[PDB]
């Protein structure tokens, strides 16, 4: 479902060439729940961004659902992202002037081909907010009228909106108390197991990582090692 | 050192009233290390913002270093924040066009004690980035050229810059791996014990909270309970 083939991501800082990722190889099967851990700065978000078609590798190849994405243009990558990917940003990236509900309705409307009635919109968006454990009374608040954890739940609800087959979550529980985070992880488990969604979670929380069937550890831009939490 | 007296913070949403904090009472002594925990939305940041003079209570009173902040004008409040408090934001709030180093230096330029030379300012700023465990090689990166955890460390270094007596950290380890977070907590322990700094940390991580002398738990805008540790 997701394949990174000899992926390198570099940045040129002055006269020095920096490696965010260096020759990484990764294959994630359809319906797999994979966790990604590693030191601050090890390359986790760069990896998730590349998998999410939000960034292109400097070298190497990327395949999402068998399609080589690394040579597609801006327009084309957008269609793939919208159809196949639900992305939970670490920084949330909510639109300031839209309410929590409107923020969730965005990717629903961008993906959906026809004309969706306001009633199906509100309804579906609400389902997403409920799955993301955010109380209905907060649906009307703008991002700046919400707490960090409430904002994180809006970010999670938005990733679910387009019912994408792939869910990429960058530290989805970072701003949540352990009880709320646990419900979020149970949601991801349910979508993965019952719905066959491919789930990839970047996290600094071992308890969160343990919901995966594999934990990939990065170190200095490279896959240092892997952990199989299931037999093979 | 910090006192919240019957503090309420309300928001008017339409015709509805929302109590971010409702009649909270809090007394933090000088040199105390206190942790604040509670469910998402319980009122932790509102509390820290009020203590940090970044927001005013709707009702109740606030005292910092024995000074009542309630009716101080904006310049008086800016003055208190600058001398008394080092604030680590949850969202970081770094200036996009300034490098990591420049972001840390900014507070030094507007510290109304005396006047630091350009060399002294830079040197103090590097010391702060080092205490915050950020490698020297990242000092020239702008916020957008840094990872989430690297940005968090710049935010922490900036809070340390004016060597304030009070440090307010809003989930200071949220974007850090446990190893780096542990060093940050060891730094706060060091500044608290060796330097007598008053430290208040809001966190969702119990391991982080356990560095405090006590842990204050919020629930629905109210202090639910307190738990002494040592
Ligand atoms: N401008 C506002 N208008 C309305 N409600 C607000 C506003 N700012 C904050 N709130 C509300 O006050 C309470 C929240 O915030 P605080 O920001 O104090 O939460 P926290 O306790 O810090 O939680 P989190 O762990 O989710 O960051 C929330 O329930 C939130 O919805
Ligand atoms: N635009 C950029 N220019 C230069 N270096 C960059 C840029 N974006 C990211 N990096 C670097 O690539 C590596 C980082 O990021 P990533 O953002 O992939 O880290 P992470 O592994 O997700 O870490 P964190 O836990 O801190 O979030 C870091 O060392 C970082 O400084
Ligand atoms: Na990151
Ligand atoms: Na908060």
From Swiss-Prot, chain A:
Domain ABC transporter: 2-232
Coiled-coil stretches: none
GO term, biological process aspect, one: transmembrane transport
Keywords: ATP-binding, Nucleotide-binding, Transport
GO cellular component, one term: plasma membrane
Family membership: Belongs to the ABC transporter superfamily.
Name of the protein described by the UniProt record: Uncharacterized ABC transporter ATP-binding protein MJ0796
High-level lineage: Archaea, Methanobacteriati, Methanobacteriota, Methanomada group, Methanococci
